[PDB]
Design a protein around this nucleic acid. Structure first.
Ligand SMILES: [Zn+2]
Ligand SMILES: [Zn+2]
Ligand SMILES: [Zn+2]
Lengths: 503, 372
DNA sequence: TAATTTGGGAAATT
DNA sequence: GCCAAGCGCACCTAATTTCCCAAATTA
RNA sequence: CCGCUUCACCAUGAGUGAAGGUGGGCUGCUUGCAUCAGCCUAAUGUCGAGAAGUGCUUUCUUCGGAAAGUAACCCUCGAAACAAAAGGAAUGCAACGGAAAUUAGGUGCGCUUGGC
């Protein structure tokens, strides 16, 4: 509509508790800071030589030890701590994936086999709620996880593709499958209860009492708990989410961007109606639990004209170049950071471990590849942030010049150009193109992925269609300047993508 | 006993009738297969108390699946190959894990089963006489032809190609068939290289194996680094750890060499003696590792593993390895180590017989010569 | 007032 | 060792698609 | 030592001099690059436990298959790294929409045919 959905990915500090239990936690922390009080951090110079906080003792004072947490598990026996919560989420991630799979199958069976295929796109709403929600609601007895699973299935069940057998029933084979969670928002509804006690980001997820299973299976030990129904006998789980490094980010005193979106979700201005919890990285035995809130932010709408139409094309010298129909102002994505990245992805090239078969052998394929797997995780984070930085740049350009439609070279044209910087000297064009599209969206600009028509050769000014400036000719001179028979190369290619004539 | 699968293109057989029949049998069978895995999973797990044995999978597949895919296709071969194709893919214990769901294929990459007569090539397969159906279903518009029994109306079809299957090619139609199928003369040579540590080769053959030093060089880097940093006793402990790594590395090169020889049956293998690859002056070991290495243990591990696979090791002399030509034997006296350093270690060239390739494989083939 | 449940009814590839 | 051709198995990468609802009823 | 960087200089470099430096990684609490403090590093390593699967060995048959065992497997799960789970933990610059699935192609390895 007038809005756009985003996540905010947020790390779970610790399960939050009563006002009582959190009051006593806080007051013991200040109790130890008061007990303890040569050098200090700035906060403890204002209460000497300055040292980094890590090295400060009036910071190091506060961190609580198991002595206290045992005195607490005694005092308040119903309060919730990390062990039971981590056990619960490990259970819910397994039960969720089991449901997603058995539900897709029961759904396939009730639509094509039992039904006899007599289904359109609206009887699918019907079947999803009946089959898939009812299954999840018998298991989880918690409408929010059941309604969250309805949606996580609805996303992957394609009825016309599945009827004409242009694909197979989807199935998840994942250790770490999100728990989805839907509370309804807008109108009389608000979504998930977000609170901010002393400027901390608390989210409260509706949950029922849990009593540990008497006879636990031997073969799947994870299934430890037996959830009451939330409507019957509720025990909600409140999570404290980390907003400390962001409170320092200099974007925390700004009107646009991730820090301002977080400030709004804490203030109550943005409501959340989808959260999606899953594990991050193993820290000890025990993991980092991320919580991916999902908000819809409005459009920024800094003045843009659809009257001015712009162009992006993949260039030989520079990997993307930007143009405007009749302005003569341009942009070129510099190839400096990309070069640093290319030197790195040469180092992370374990071709021997990939191929030898005498190496890392006899513990299965997860461990045969661990070294390679860990470098692709670190490399695909580099490319992502690089692509985001370019899309950030490109957007800033068009916004400066006040462009409202931006035509960009179609995915096939780029992926099989055979004179792209990515081909000559090196790539995800889905991701690159999407990330540019989505940035421009946020401000108001409109992408229309367009058709080429002999881009590289066609004269951007008079219209002559050349065959002399073909790849090998230009390669032969070694990517020379451009001139025409009837009256820069990359700039021209972009500026013939910036032609409204194309379809 | 192994199954050799030959897959050759049905370019000719008329034609468009055959293409349309194939598209339809593909789709029709893909329906029976995906709907049979689904109907079956639903009956064991989502209905039948979450337990059943191979007994029930048998009763179902034999009754429902075979009777459906036989009462439709009317061809025993298709129905029987398909019956097997489901049985194969409904793995009852793999499923009792809830480890994953079901292998449900798209009706393209799904091969038509079939079960012969052949001339030099023209395949010839027993198939029913298809008459087109006079009432075409509005909602299933791809199925045009209804098939007849292969005993009552056998219209057996022939295919000129350039357990049997038919399938698309990844527009043209490949045909697979599987078939049931169940040396002290040949002399090999291992030679210490200059870009690859050890390169091994076979005389009168073209096959080779070159040992990469990636693992070795990377380790060496890191070890020098820890040293440099330690020099502003742990360096003793780094020594002992480094030795443990080199010892295991030599074992892994010995396994890789032995495997490369046992593959090509090579029952005698020969490699220059300890002194002849201790002081070679162009060897990788001297010009990269500064003549510090455990050569003795290398040769001893290689020979022990190579004799633990029945291969006999013969210890030859160099006789101008680098310079001498493999294919004819004219010494390229110009090809001094000195010549090679001034350049960037180029390929060999015999100007007499005109045979240019990698000086290490050249050396390898020079060793492997029996008269050595 | 918050959590839970319900929403509807065919048509292809060369 | 590579190339060509295909099969079998598992993993990786790219591209695409879809969701992130809303209304009504029941504790 | 460098298939490390830079200063150069010679003939794209697994060239020569000078200085420097993990030249690989882990934690620093959303991410990237660079610093910084502490650490691990034989890590492109070494190995543990297991039985779902490909295979294998033994049996059984109502010959589709079934039951046992092994343990070779890109077989399965897992294993290094800050301080003393609960904000104990940085400095600079830059960014921050995530999740699930499908499809395709490819990489990697073994074998059945053939050559250079
Ligand atoms: Zn302090
Ligand atoms: Zn012109
Ligand atoms: Zn010669």
């Amino acid at each position: 509509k007038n809005t756009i959905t985003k996540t905010l990915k947020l790390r779970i500090v610790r399960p939050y508790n009563s006002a009582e239990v959190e009051k006593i936690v806080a007051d013991e922390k200040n109790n130890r800071e008061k007990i303890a009080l040569k050098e200090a951090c700035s906060k403890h110079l204002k209460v000497t030589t300055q040292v980094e906080r890590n090295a400060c003792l009036f910071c190091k004072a506060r961190k609580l030890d198991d002595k206290f947490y045992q005195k607490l598990r005694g005092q308040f026996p119903d309060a919730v701590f990390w062990q039971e919560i981590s056990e619960i989420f490990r259970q819910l991630q397994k039960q969720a994936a089991e449901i997603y799979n058995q539900s897709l199958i029961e759904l396939y069976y009730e639509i094509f086999i039992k039904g006899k295929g007599i289904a359109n796109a609206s009887s699918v709403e019907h079947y999803l709620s009946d089959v898939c929600y009812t299954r999840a609601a018998e298991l989880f007895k918690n409408a929010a996880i059941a309604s969250g699973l309805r949606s996580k299935i609805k996303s992957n069940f394609r009825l016309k593709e599945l009827k004409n057998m242009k694909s197979g029933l989807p199935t998840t084979k994942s250790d770490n499958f999100p728990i989805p969670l839907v509370k309804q928002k807008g109108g009389q509804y608000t979504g998930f209860e977000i609170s901010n006690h002393n400027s901390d980001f608390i989210i409260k997820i509706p949950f029922g009492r849990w009593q540990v299973k008497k006879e636990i299976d031997k073969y799947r030990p994870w299934e430890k708990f037996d959830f009451e129904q939330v409507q019957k006998s509720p025990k909600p789980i409140s999570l404290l989410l980390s907003t400390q490094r962001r409170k320092r980010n200099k974007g925390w005193s700004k009107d646009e961007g991730t820090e301002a979106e977080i400030k709004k979700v804490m203030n109550g201005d943005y409501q959340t109606s989808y959260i999606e919890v899953k594990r991050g990285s193993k820290i000890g035995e025990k993991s980092a639990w991320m919580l991916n809130l999902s908000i819809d932010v409005p459009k920024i709408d800094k003045g843009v004209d659809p009257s001015i139409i712009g162009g992006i094309a993949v260039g030989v010298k520079s990997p993307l170049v930007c143009a405007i129909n009749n302005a003569f102002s341009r942009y070129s994505i510099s190839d400096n950071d990309l070069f640093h990245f290319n030197k790195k992805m040469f180092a992370r090239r374990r071709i021997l471990l990939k191929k030898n078969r005498h190496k890392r052998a006899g513990h299965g394929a997860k461990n045969k590849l661990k070294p390679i797997t860990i470098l692709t995780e670190k490399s695909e984070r580099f490319r992502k942030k690089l692509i985001e930085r370019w899309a950030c740049e490109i957007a800033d350009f068009f916004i400066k010049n006040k462009v409202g439609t931006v035509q960009m070279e179609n995915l096939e044209s780029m992926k099989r150009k055979e004179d792209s910087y990515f081909n000559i000297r090196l790539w995800p064009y889905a991701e690159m193109q999407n990330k540019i599209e989505f940035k421009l969206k946020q401000y108001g600009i409109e992408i229309r992925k367009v058709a080429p028509n002999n881009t590289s050769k066609t004269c951007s000014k008079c219209g002559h269609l050349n065959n002399y400036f073909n790849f090998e000719y230009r390669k032969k001179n070694k990517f020379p300047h451009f001139k025409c028979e009837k009256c820069n190369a990359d700039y021209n290619a972009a500026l013939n993508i910036s032609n409204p004539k194309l379809k | 006993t192994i199954t050799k699968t030959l897959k050759l293109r049905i370019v000719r057989p008329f034609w468009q009738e055959i293409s349309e029949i194939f598209r339809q049998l593909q789709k029709q069978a893909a329906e029976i297969y995906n709907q049979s895995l689904i109907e079956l999973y639903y009956e064991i797990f989502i209905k039948g108390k979450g337990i059943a044995n191979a007994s029930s999978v048998e009763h179902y597949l034999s009754d429902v699946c075979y009777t459906r895919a036989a009462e439709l296709f009317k061809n025993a071969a298709i129905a029987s190959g398909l019956r097997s194709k489901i049985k194969s893919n409904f793995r009852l214990k793999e499923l009792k894990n809830m480890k994953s769901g079901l292998p449900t294929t798209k009706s393209d990459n799904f091969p038509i089963p079939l079960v012969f007569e052949i001339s030099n090539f023209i395949i010839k397969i027993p198939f029913g006489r298809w008459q087109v159906k006079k009432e075409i279903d509005k909602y299933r518009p791809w199925e045009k032809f209804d098939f007849e029994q292969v005993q009552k109306s056998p219209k057996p079809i022939s295919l000129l190609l350039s357990y049997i299957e038919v399938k698309r090619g990844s527009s043209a139609w490949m045909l697979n068939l599987s078939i049931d199928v169940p040396d002290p003369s040949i002399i090999g040579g291992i030679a210490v290289g200059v870009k690859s540590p050890l390169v091994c080769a076979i005389n009168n053959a073209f096959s080779r194996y070159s040992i990469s030093d990636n693992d070795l060089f990377h380790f060496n880097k890191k070890m020098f680094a820890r040293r440099r940093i330690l020099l502003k006793k742990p360096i003793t402990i780094l020594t002992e750890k480094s030795e443990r790594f080199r010892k295991k590395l030599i074992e892994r090169w010995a396994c890789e060499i032995a495997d490369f020889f046992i593959k090509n049956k090579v029952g005698t293998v020969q490699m220059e003696n300890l002194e002849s690859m201790k002081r070679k002056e162009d060897s990788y070991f001297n010009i990269r590792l500064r003549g510090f290495w455990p050569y003795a243990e290398m040769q001893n591990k290689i020979e022990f593993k190579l004799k633990q696979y029945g291969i006999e090791i013969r210890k030859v002399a160099p006789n101008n390895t680098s310079k001498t030509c493999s294919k004819c034997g004219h010494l390229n006296n110009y090809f001094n180590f000195e010549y090679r350093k001034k350049n960037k270690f180029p390929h060999f060239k015999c100007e007499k017989c005109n045979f240019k390739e990698n000086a290490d494989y050249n050396a390898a083939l020079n060793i492997s010569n029996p008269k050595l």
